[PDB]
Structures are given as structure tokens and as C-alpha cells.
Amino acid sequence: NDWEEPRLDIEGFVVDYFTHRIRQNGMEWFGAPGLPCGVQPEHEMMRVMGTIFEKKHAENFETFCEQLLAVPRISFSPYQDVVRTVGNAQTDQCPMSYGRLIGLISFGGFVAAKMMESVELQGQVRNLFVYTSLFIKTRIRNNWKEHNRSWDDFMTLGKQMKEDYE
Amino acid sequence: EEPRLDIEGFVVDYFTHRIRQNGMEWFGAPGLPCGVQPEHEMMRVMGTIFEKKHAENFETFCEQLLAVPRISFSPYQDVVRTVGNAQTDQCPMSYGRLIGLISFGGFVAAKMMESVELQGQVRNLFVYTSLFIKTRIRNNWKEHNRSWDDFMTLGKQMKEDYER
């Protein structure tokens, strides 16, 4: 099971993508833990899948951000409800498909980028990163093998899809 | 720089290994004064792993190189030079590029030997590949914290994962 390889640890994907997204917004995330392995080709592919996902729903991401900012005290709980819902959203395939994985990291990276534009929100960036990583980590553990999904297959499909938008 | 670890030695051993793996024997292989080193056996493994990952591409690269009029040697030099000058924030001659160049070069050497008409250019292949890597390796490794010992350690670990 390639998703069990320390090189492919979910934390790595989240940190890399979040860092990448923030930079795309003209900023330098100087509080991002390091990549104890360096950038991997799979992270490279995630950056693309995430970019394509965002562009496809740029308007909605903006509206989602606005609705989250409307919650009293701008609590982190509603964001967990978002994440949890995506994971528990029914299907006859993997509860944590490549699509949901990508959607969660793409939306999470977008939110991270916006939150960094506000000092008042920067503290909660640790929550965002940690929670997103731990949630996805658990769901892959109890879903990928059964529904025969893997990073190799992910890469196989990702390349072909990156080509269509290229 | 232990004479035992001379770059030309790595190229010769790997090229010889790959040619023999193709069912043949390289009778033009210069000698390795110090014999087969453990660093050489590791390069053999890394090279094999590398080729298996990109076997199909290696095949295509060969075909494209054979489509160059007169089957000139310069386009291959363009390949090698391009790899060394690709750009990076690390060692221009990282273990990956070293393995890639020796693995592809060995693949090409094995294919060339299957053709008496191309055998003469095998000398160009190994002399040039060795010299290019040599000129590139130090004045470039001792400043990017890269060494054979480190190559061996990382390589040992990677080898095990692939051996299940």
C-alpha cells in the first residue's frame, strides 16, 4: 500500500499544497513546517489537480469563504463540519475518492491563502492545516485498500487529466 | 578522490553489466584495475530500478536518436549536456542525474552493441559520458553535501523497499 510510505504521508501533501497556494497569493508562509523528504512528484501533481479544481469553482470558493466569515466569532467548528460532511457524503465508491481528497486540499489551500491575508486569522492557520491532515489521514486508512485506490493509480489518471487541460 | 571510485570505473562497470544483461559480452571493455566495488554493485541496482521505471521511454528515446541523419553522436551529447544544465536549487549532478545518465547510457550501449555498424561509436558513448560526469561531479559535490557514503546509505534503504 503506497499510501503507507513515509514519503507519501498525507501531512506532506497538505503542507506542500497549502504552502504553494499561499505563495500563489503573493505571500511567504514563514511558519510552515518543513518537508522532511522534499517536494515529491506526487505533490507536484496535487498542485495541478488542486489548481484545476479551484479554477473550476473559483466563484463558489469565494462565496463559501464569505459564509464562513459570517459565523459568530469566526469559529473553526463550522470548517470541520465542511470537511466531515465531504467525507460522510454518500457514494458507491470510496468515501475518500481522489476527487474528495483533491477537493478538500484545494478548498483548504484556498482558505489558508485567504486567512493569511489577516493577522487576526493567522493563528487559526495551524488548526486548518493540522485538522485537514489528520482527517484525510484517517479516511484513507479505512477506505483506499478496500476500494482499490492508490497514489500510483492517482498519478496515472492525474497525468492524463493534466494533459486535457494542457 | 580514491582511484577506486573513479567515475570512468562506474561507467565501464555499469555499461559492461547492462551489455551482459542483454545476452552479450563487451570485449572492448577497458579493465577495472581495482575490480568490482560495492559502490559499483549499488549503481547496478539503482540503474536497473531507474530503467524499469522508464523502460518504454528509453525505447522511444533510442528510436528518436536513430532517426537523426547519419546517426550522428552530437544529439546524444545534447541529451547529456541538457541533463547536467537542467536547472535546480541543488547539486546539478545529484545522485538522480548521475543514475539517470549512467542508466540511459548503459541502455544505449547495450542496444548499440547489437549492431556491428554502431559498435565503433560505443567508445564515444562511454568516454564522453564518463568525462562529462567527471568534469561535473566535483567542484560540485563537496559544495552540496553529496558523497558516495551518503549515496550508499540512501541507496541501501531504497534498494530494500524495491526488494519487498
Binding site: 522534499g38 | 528515446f61 528518436q64 546524444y76 545534447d78 541538457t82 545529484s94 538522480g96 551518503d150
Partner: peptide, 29 residues
Amino acid sequence: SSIGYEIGSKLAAMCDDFDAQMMSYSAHA
């Protein structure tokens, strides 16, 4: 030619991908 440059560009990417992976074992402690 020009083919050597493009073949080289691909080899370099493949090479860097291999290096990245191999360099992830320098990831323990």
C-alpha cells in the same frame, strides 16, 4: 537534432523525480 534537447529535458525530469524519492530516506531521526 533539437531532439537531444527535448530527450534531455525529459531525462532530467525523470532524474529529478528519482533523486527526490531517494533523498526522502535522508528523512528519519
